[PDB]
Motif scaffolding. Structure first.
Motif, short mmCIF file in Angstrom:
data_model
loop_
_atom_site.label_atom_id
_atom_site.label_comp_id
_atom_site.label_asym_id
_atom_site.label_seq_id
_atom_site.Cartn_x
_atom_site.Cartn_y
_atom_site.Cartn_z
N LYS A 191 14.63 6.76 -15.07
CA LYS A 191 13.95 7.95 -15.43
C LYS A 191 13.23 7.78 -14.24
N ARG A 192 12.72 9.31 -13.46
CA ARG A 192 11.63 10.07 -12.49
C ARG A 192 10.09 9.44 -12.52
N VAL A 193 9.20 9.10 -12.05
CA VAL A 193 8.56 8.47 -12.48
C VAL A 193 7.10 9.77 -12.05
N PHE A 194 8.07 11.03 -10.97
CA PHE A 194 6.82 11.51 -10.89
C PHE A 194 8.39 12.91 -10.95
N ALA A 195 7.96 14.16 -11.32
CA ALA A 195 8.49 14.53 -12.56
C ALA A 195 8.93 16.12 -11.43
N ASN A 196 7.88 16.31 -10.90
CA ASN A 196 8.27 17.41 -10.05
C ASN A 196 8.23 17.23 -8.29
N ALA A 197 8.22 15.44 -8.21
CA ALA A 197 8.30 15.62 -6.41
C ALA A 197 9.96 16.00 -6.13
N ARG A 247 -0.49 20.91 -1.42
CA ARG A 247 0.52 20.31 -1.18
C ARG A 247 -0.45 18.81 -1.86
N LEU A 248 0.14 18.01 -2.77
CA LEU A 248 -0.39 16.65 -2.89
C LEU A 248 0.77 15.77 -2.52
N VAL A 249 0.68 14.77 -1.31
CA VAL A 249 2.35 13.89 -1.29
C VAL A 249 1.50 12.86 -1.09
N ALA A 283 1.12 11.57 -12.03
CA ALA A 283 2.34 11.94 -11.44
C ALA A 283 3.09 12.91 -11.35
N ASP A 284 2.86 13.85 -12.60
CA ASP A 284 3.55 14.95 -12.53
C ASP A 284 3.27 16.13 -11.63
N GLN A 285 1.65 16.07 -10.89
CA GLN A 285 0.76 16.11 -9.95
C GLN A 285 1.58 16.36 -8.68
N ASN A 323 1.15 -1.40 0.32
CA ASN A 323 0.20 0.02 0.28
C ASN A 323 1.51 1.29 -0.35
N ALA A 324 0.43 2.49 -0.59
CA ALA A 324 1.24 3.80 -0.31
C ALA A 324 -0.16 4.64 -0.37
N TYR A 325 0.19 5.84 0.09
CA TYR A 325 -1.29 7.27 0.31
C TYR A 325 -0.88 8.05 -0.30
N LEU A 326 -1.75 8.74 -0.59
CA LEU A 326 -1.69 9.88 -1.26
C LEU A 326 -2.30 11.00 -0.32
N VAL A 327 -1.72 12.18 -0.29
CA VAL A 327 -2.40 13.44 1.19
C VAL A 327 -2.35 13.93 0.39
N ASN A 328 -3.99 15.01 0.69
CA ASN A 328 -4.13 16.56 -0.72
C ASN A 328 -4.35 17.08 0.79
N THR A 329 -2.60 17.77 0.97
CA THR A 329 -3.41 18.74 2.51
C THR A 329 -3.97 20.26 1.84
#
Ligand SMILES: [Zn+2]
Ligand SMILES: [Zn+2]
Ligand SMILES: [Zn+2]
Ligand SMILES: [Zn+2]
Lengths: 288, 288
Positions: free
Chosen positions: A118-124, A63-65, A93-95, A54-60
């Motif tokens: 290559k980075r999966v998450f370009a802007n992180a 930010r999106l973390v 992914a880019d968000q 599992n992983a967890y996306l948190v929209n604060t």
């Protein structure tokens, strides 16, 4: 494999990166009579347990973390679903603004790079516990490592390095981002770290690999798994974590707790009983 | 609110129609000291339980069959999610071939008609238990019912009549389609019926309103709910069902069991403990 919950003003989406099957030979402290009794309690036939990643996306709100990023392709086709779980949750992914790593194992960190490195998450920003970074970058450690496990050190470095110039090394007790504090959970790896989210008086602890086999290790928190770098330490950190969580009725999430991985514990004799979170009925079917 | 499982060659998708909240006054046999003990066991604060409304899409190979259809707009905006759960499962309403009704209560039947009283499922045969049809069409039953409940009779009749000419009445122990049998589960309503799915030596019993409040009625199967038309008979049916389910480790689904509502029971004393199905990791994650 995407489920969305509210924690104060934060939205937390549970994401399923995939699953792996483990049998008793990876269990530290295992006994067969007790293993069978525990499997019978959960109506499990045979001795294989199927464990999610599992992983967890948190929209604060600002930010999106991501907490952890699954595996990519490193452990076979039963993992690496995270990028399409993100699409399910309506996110590309880019968000993603920041990736918080609980520890630099394949199933948490390797999903940050693709096949080409290559980075999966370009802007992180890649946020690593510095105690864990130090371990995975230590050659003494890497060279003292059973030959089949040397690829872990090498793979961890390659993943981290695709984020060169966009990494933050953190300690095990610091404010990381607004309403996110790190929490040292050493044992599984030296720098294994949980992340405490707080918004508007509500709390969620995302506790990484505090537990691997929930069929066994709530009832028997004294059992370990062979992938614990320091299994007695991991045992002490789990018992401390679960004691606290039970007494505060803390909502927590675990990378290898049956998906979505979230709930609370009741203290029971010398172990615990997990109480899974209810399905998010209102969030998905009203509130928004 | 759509999760896909396999039972032999059948694909069974759990579909969430929504939720409702219930407090102790609807519980038959309730006792406050025991209610609080059972709530503490599941870490419920306060005395409200949030219960799902589930329905189940079964793809038999060449045919799409719904077991139950949710509520539409008839009990307010916390229900009526089924059309959108179907969409999320990649099926539109016009693809549904048959609706097997467990009993003609609002949260099961009224989802077959929209707010204007026209068919939600333009191509489906409505399959009703003959015994329940008889009860909801009984003028004496409707006339001796509390005032607040008489619209359940009238709304049942209107929902059924939308399917006039495309209705089939069935008996309580018959084959409905190959591998699908009706099974009378009397008490909650006179003609309340479950459906037994058998494919390639795998079975699933979709047991409708066999249970309402899993925080209480597995531990205390002798407790009923005020909506049980004969609560003593509902208790007897529930105990017989769970007794057999436990001894054969039958996989079953319930319309009001925490979503997705699927699992097994183990007998403990003269009560039961529910073991929820695992998330369908493999089926939905290893794809061709
Ligand atoms: Zn790990
Ligand atoms: Zn792990
Ligand atoms: Zn009912
Ligand atoms: Zn019902």
């Amino acid at each position: 494999g995407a489920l969305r919950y509210k924690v104060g003003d934060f939205e937390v989406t549970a994401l399923l990166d995939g699953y792996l099957d483990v049998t008793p030979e990876v269990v530290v402290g295992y006994d067969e009579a007790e293993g069978q009794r525990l499997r019978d309690k959960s109506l499990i036939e045979g001795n294989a347990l199927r464990i999610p990643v599992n992983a967890y996306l948190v929209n604060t709100g600002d930010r999106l973390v991501l907490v952890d990023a699954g595996t990519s392709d490193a452990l076979g086709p039963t993992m690496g679903r995270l990028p399409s779980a993100l699409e399910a949750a309506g996110v590309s992914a880019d968000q993603v603004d920041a990736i918080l790593i609980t520890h630099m194992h394949p199933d948490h960190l390797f999903g940050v790079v693709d096949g080409e490195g290559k980075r999966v998450f370009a802007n992180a920003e890649l946020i690593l516990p510095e105690v864990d970074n130090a371990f995975w970058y230590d050659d003494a450690a890497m060279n003292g490592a059973p030959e089949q496990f040397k690829p872990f050190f090498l793979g961890a470095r390659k993943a981290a390095e695709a984020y060169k110039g966009n990494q933050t090394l953190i300690s095990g007790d610091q404010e990381v981002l607004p309403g996110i504090r790190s929490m040292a959970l050493p044992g599984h790896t030296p720098g294994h770290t949980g992340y405490l989210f707080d918004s508007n008086g509500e709390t969620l602890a995302i506790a990484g690999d505090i537990i691997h086999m929930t069929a066994y290790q709530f009832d028997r928190p004294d059992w370990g798994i062979g992938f614990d770098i320091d299994s007695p330490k991991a045992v002490e950190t789990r018992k401390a974590f679960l004691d606290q969580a039970a007494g505060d009725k803390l909502f927590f999430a675990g990378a290898h707790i049956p998906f979505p991985g979230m709930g609370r514990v009741v203290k029971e004799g010398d172990g615990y009983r997990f109480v899974a979170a209810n399905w998010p009925y209102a969030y998905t079917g009203l509130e928004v």
